Design a protein around this ligand. Structure first.
Ligand code: CL
Ligand code: K
Length: 771
């Protein structure tokens, strides 16, 4: 019985608080009070329409064939205005909808299944999912979170442990390159890949003939932001404009560098294209802690499309040929590592051999360091990695790429003076210690912009410096003050994230507790009643579980990440796909299959609930006669785990065979059969460090490499003379090696003059910030 009034008419959803910093006035005051640098704002000319065939002559046929728009929009207007970037933050105080909704259906299903099943780990799984729903929130944070994040970046860069250039730490570019030959082994780009000698649009071959139509340019995310000067546009809306701007910037830089006044010309080009150094401060979508919603929002420094393209032309041809890591090469690098297809078992074999031989082990992946020492596994992360970066760290990376990557077999460069100018003299100051845009505020970026094309490379170099210093200090244990003292030594902040004790015993336990029943145990299509002990390496987010069926370790997503993903799944995040009938149900199937595939299969309660949900959806589709195989075959793009599990289809329900197939290695593994690094093959990181400590590798032997190192010390007014010193090697003239030797000697001699010594990175930053 209820009243007529009533008759007439699970954790609660998180509602973010009102954000007091959501206005330019309040945000600017907050930053001023916290002494965060706000730049004097710079203006961008309005857009002018130009004919595509005049601006991009190489693409005339594409315009004629109606495959490319006949006009391009470029910032050449008579009036210039200050740009404004207002990102959405969801959920927010006024809007708590489907975006960032926790999976309450899964929570109810986990509860129903726990009541029917006696899984000993079942109560803890339910408790963890409920706790993650109650304490976390998937979304794009807040203006307060973004602003507080900027303060933390400034604190890392300039606070307790101010940043140090590699030169202050005690490394020359050549010494760093010797370390990188070991920690980031690289191959040269393919001989058929064009050298760094051209305007980007010249790398497009279009005639209409499908058999030959090719682009030698890097691939791009079409739906991603164009960045400045095209706020609100995607890369798909602005590819022609990006080519025009990237061609103009490289062309103007090249002409200015060899002009009668290189300093005036180079500075003018940099000032005219200032916006190529300013990133849109995009709030990153993550599973944030509800109580810290306004205290921290991670940012993506959204690089201008032309800058992204020019930087990617230097890095991607090298990196595409350099998927060299500890599982296939004798290197600490984890670059290109996959724990699938036997990857985790190769890691476990290396770990087990190190433990058996009483050897220390180090692994590096960007801002992640892994140390095995004293029967303990340590996970060390750089503290807000990007904030530690100086333009000189990126310049050392450019030096490494141009000396070890962009080089011919005879030692001649695979670049001309224009590209050496962009790469060495300008590019590091475009994305490191430059600026970002939030609302109408042009803010200083402390360190490198997170998400720029060189993020991974720059972070990897910083971890390389920390590791080289660790080796130099006699490998102090990560839990000691001697290890923590490497922060001040390097100017790089870091923290011990994980300490996995009794490693040897943990591995024995993981093998012994491996279940006899279920997936990868006896190979049935059921989870184990009692999962075995995981080796919680958190190796790029992965733990290791022993398989009795396959007689190997296999990866499972680290528990906390698995629970967070189950509690707050990412939605479809594609309005076009979402409007197609069956895309939502297909995405729901994908979400439940992917959570099982990454590790849910080994969590009995989670596997039971997720299997039931995906089977129920498939059954409904079958009865209804609705075919979604198209979406299920091309599932990768609709899943946060899509990049992790390539080459598999979700059109058939997950079985033991799916788990066998994803873990199947192409080849057997022998760690002793791994090739040595392409450069200094016989040398180890320890031998290189010993050589450096003694004063070796200060200068490269190659005159071409000496010119490139001198390029990092000489002021911009010397660019025309530096171009003349490089022209013989760059043109591969007869006797270029002897000619380069004489020119590098003449240049080293003239460098005695201190008035010629100024970082072009400082000159670039000064020209970018000019008002
Ligand atoms: Cl940031
Ligand atoms: K620092």
């Amino acid at each position: 019985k209820a009243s007529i009034l009533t008759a007439l008419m699970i954790p609660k959803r998180f509602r973010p608080a009102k954000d007091p910093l959501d206005s330019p006035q309040a945000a600017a005051q907050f930053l001023k009070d916290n002494k965060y640098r706000i730049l004097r704002p710079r203006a961008i000319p309005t857009m002018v329409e130009l004919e595509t065939d005049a601006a991009l002559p190489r693409l005339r046929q594409m315009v004629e064939d109606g495959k490319l728009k006949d006009t391009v929009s470029v910032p050449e207007g008579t009036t210039a205005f200050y740009p404004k970037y207002y990102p959405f933050h969801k959920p927010d105080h006024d809007e708590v909808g489907t975006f960032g909704a926790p999976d309450i259906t899964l929570l109810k299903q986990l509860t129903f299944f726990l009541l029917e099943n006696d899984f000993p780990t079942g109560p803890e799984t339910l408790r963890q999912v409920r706790e993650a729903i109650a304490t976390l929130q998937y979304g794009s944070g807040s203006y307060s979170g973004q602003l507080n994040r900027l303060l933390a970046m400034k604190g890392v860069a300039t606070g307790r442990n101010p940043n140090k250039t590699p030169k202050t730490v005690g490394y020359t570019n050549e010494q760093l390159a010797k370390l990188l030959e070991q920690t980031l082994p690289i191959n040269t780009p393919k001989h058929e890949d064009p050298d760094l000698r051209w305007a980007p649009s010249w790398l497009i071959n279009y005639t209409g003939d499908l058999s030959t139509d090719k682009s030698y340019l890097p691939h791009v995310t079409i739906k991603s932001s164009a960045g400045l000067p095209y706020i609100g546009k995607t890369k798909g809306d602005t590819t022609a404009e990006a080519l025009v701007l990237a061609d103009s910037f490289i062309r103007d830089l090249g002409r200015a560098a060899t002009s009668a006044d290189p300093e005036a010309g180079v500075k003018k080009t940099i000032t005219d294209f200032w916006y190529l150094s300013c990133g849109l401060l995009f709030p990153k979508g993550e599973r944030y802690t509800q109580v810290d919603w306004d205290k921290k929002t991670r940012n993506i420094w959204s690089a201008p499309y032309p800058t992204h393209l020019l930087l990617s032309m230097v890095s991607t041809p090298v990196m595409n040929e350099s998927k060299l890591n500890i599982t296939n090469t004798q290197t600490p690098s984890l670059y290109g590592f996959s724990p699938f297809h036997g990857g985790m078992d190769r890691i476990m074999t290396i770990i087990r051999d190190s433990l058996d031989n009483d050897e220390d082990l180090v692994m590096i992946y960007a801002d992640n360091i892994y140390i095995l020492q004293d029967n303990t596994w340590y996970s060390i992360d750089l503290e807000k990695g990007e904030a530690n970066c100086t333009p000189q760290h990126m310049q050392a990376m450019m030096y490494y790429l141009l000396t070890r990557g962009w080089t011919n077999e005879d030692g001649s460069p695979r670049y001309n003076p224009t590209w050496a100018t962009f790469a060495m003299n300008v590019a590091p100051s475009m994305v490191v210690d430059s600026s970002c845009l939030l609302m109408n505020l042009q803010l200083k970026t402390y360190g490198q912009g997170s998400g720029n094309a060189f993020t991974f490379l720059n972070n990897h170099l910083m971890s390389t410096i920390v590791v080289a210093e660790w080796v130099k200090a006699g490998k102090p244990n990560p839990m000691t003050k001697e290890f923590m003292d490497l922060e001040e030594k390097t100017g790089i902040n870091f923290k011990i994230e994980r300490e996995l004790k009794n490693l040897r015993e943990t591995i024995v336990e993981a093998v012994e507790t491996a279940p006899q029943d279920g997936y990868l145990a006896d190979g049935s299509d059921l989870p184990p009643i009692r999962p075995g002990k995981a080796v919680e390496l958190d190796l790029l987010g992965w733990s290791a579980i022993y398989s009795r069926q396959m007689e190997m370790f296999v990866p499972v997503l680290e528990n906390e990440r698995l629970i967070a993903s189950a509690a707050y799944p990412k939605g479809l995040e594609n309005k076009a796909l979402a409007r197609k009938p069956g895309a939502e149900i297909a995405y729901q199937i994908v979400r439940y299959e992917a959570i099982r595939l990454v590790g849910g299969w080994n969590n009995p309660l989670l596997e039971t609930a997720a299997k039931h949900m995906s089977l129920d959806k498939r059954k409904r589709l079958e009865v209804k006669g609705i075919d979604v195989t198209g979406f299920l075959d091309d599932w990768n793009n609709m899943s946060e785990f899509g990049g992790d599990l390539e080459g598999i289809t979700l059109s058939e329900p997950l079985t033991n065979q799916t788990l066998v197939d994803i873990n199947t290695p192409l080849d057997s593994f022998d760690p002793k059969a791994r090739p040595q690094t392409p450069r200094s093959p016989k040398k180890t990181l320890d031998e290189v460090t010993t050589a450096i400590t003694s004063g070796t590798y200060k200068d490269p032997k190659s005159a071409v490499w000496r010119l490139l190192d001198q390029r990092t010390k000489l002021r911009v007014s010397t660019l025309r003379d530096q171009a003349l010193a490089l022209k013989p090697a760059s043109s591969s003239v007869d006797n270029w090696a002897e000619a380069t030797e004489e020119l590098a000697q003449q240049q080293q001699l003239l460098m005695k003059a201190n008035n010629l010594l100024k970082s072009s990175l400082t000159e670039t930053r000064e020209a970018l910030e000019k008002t």
